[PDB]
Amino acid sequence: GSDLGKKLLEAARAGQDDEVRILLANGADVNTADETGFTPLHLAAWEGHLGIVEVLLKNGADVNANDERGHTPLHLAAYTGHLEIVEVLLKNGAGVNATDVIGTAPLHLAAMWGHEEIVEVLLKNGADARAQDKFGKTPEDLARDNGYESVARLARKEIIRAVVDELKELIQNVNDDIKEVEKNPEDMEYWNKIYRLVHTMKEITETMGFSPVALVLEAIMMLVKLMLNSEIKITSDLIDAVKKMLDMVTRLLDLMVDPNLNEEQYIKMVVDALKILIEAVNVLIKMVEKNPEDMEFWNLIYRLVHVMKEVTETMGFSSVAKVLHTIMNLVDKMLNSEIKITSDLIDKVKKKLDMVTRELDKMVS
Structure with missing residues (x-):
């Protein structure tokens, strides 16, 4: 016993x-x-x-x-x-x-x-x-x-990997839903389901961090929200734009789970991410080109350019930090309605953004 x-x-x-x-x-x-x-x-x-x-x-x-x-x-x-x-x-x-x-x-x-x-x-x-x-x-x-x-950084990397897998499952759901609307654009219900998926994604991204993904998802949310409140006519070109933003979000997620390589691949990671969110800002610029005079979209462009200036400054890139600082200064002028929103101003912003893209290409090349 x-x-x-x-x-x-x-x-x-x-x-x-x-x-x-x-x-x-x-x-x-x-x-x-x-x-x-x-x-x-x-x-x-x-x-x-x-x-x-x-x-x-x-x-x-x-x-x-x-x-x-x-x-x-x-x-x-x-x-x-x-x-x-x-x-x-x-x-x-x-x-x-x-x-x-x-x-x-x-x-x-x-x-x-x-x-x-x-x-x-x-x-x-x-x-x-x-x-x-x-x-x-x-x-x-x-x-x-x-x-x-x-060990903290290792556990962080593992959490990031799992979250990226979950978000990819959400992306698959969203892609099935967008295909089903492409067949029958009449159904507004599908757009509400997609809105729910994108809102959950936005919440997860905010919870972890990943601010760039959060802001791109927020752009997605604004578009789907306008369509839900029938503020805009459901167009196929805007849907292709949403498709492109989802594709770039997925690619950025792929970027996040990079093989822990050396500083060279780290630079390539950041340059690819910079190009991806530049593509996002280009989508936003096109949308503003067609329907300006809604300052929420400008605040989002401001948020993206601010994230990019922060990324650059933390990673040096002083020329790019300065050019993006100038972009931010112009957007700041605009929000408080200092200057009158003119087509030449948006086109000038586009020119400076292209100069940014070429400066980054020069850096990586």
């Missing part, structure tokens, strides 16, 4: 390989528990005794045993940071996404103390990077709060 169970607990805790083997041989309950509910596997993983972990697992140890606090042996192995014990537990069907009472997964325990190797292993075995504990904290958040910048 309690005799062999207590001696087995104490032997697993102390690291007595032979004593564990003997006690198991004499019919000791492998899944015995202490006051708090720790089975010998919990204690073996805690103290880091790989041999005893392996032996216990061979003799029927419960890999997913929970204690009072809802902790499996994998929680404790990830906390203490014993890589090989984590690997064996996962090998024997351990719960990679097991959640305790406070909502803390093993990835939280690994990332919060910066045990990079076990974090990588856990992610390899399908660990949820976006898992949130009872306090709305992801593993990224816990690692960053404790000063582990490397």
Whole structure:
């Protein structure tokens, strides 16, 4: 009864390989528990005794045993940071996404103390990077709060990758819907469904960050909203413009999940993104060309040019920062109605934007 169970607990805790083997041989309950509910596997993983972990697992140890606090042996192995014990537990069907009472997964325990190797292993075995504990904290958040910048950046990259996959699923939905309207433009319902999809996308992008994608999605939202309130006649050319903006959003999403290359590919990433959002600004300029006098669209162009100036400044590109600063100055003049909106002004902005594009091409070329 309690005799062999207590001696087995104490032997697993102390690291007595032979004593564990003997006690198991004499019919000791492998899944015995202490006051708090720790089975010998919990204690073996805690103290880091790989041999005893392996032996216990061979003799029927419960890999997913929970204690009072809802902790499996994998929680404790990830906390203490014993890589090989984590690997064996996962090998024997351990719960990679097991959640305790406070909502803390093993990835939280690994990332919060910066045990990079076990974090990588856990992610390899399908660990949820976006898992949130009872306090709305992801593993990224816990690692960053404790000063582990490397693991924080890694968890961030994983969250970005998963979010991009989700957004691609949303893009597929939107593309099916836009095809179905292209066949029957009469249905306004499809446009409302597309509006819902784009609004959810906009919310996700704002939540993560990715301001450029958020602003392009906001342009999408304005167009679909005008069509819903029958402010504009449903044209096929405007639909092709929406198609082009969705395509560029998808491509930008592809850009975000770049293979962690070297500074050269980093430059190519930023230059491609710069060209993509320039294409977006060109779409906006064409739309303003056809229907000016709606300052919301100008505020959005301002927001995009501001994001671009920020990106450049952070990444140098002083010539481009200056040209975009001038663009922003002209737009600022316009919003407070200093100057009169004239076709020559929009055309001049277009000329300067083309000069920007050639300056970037010169930089990358």
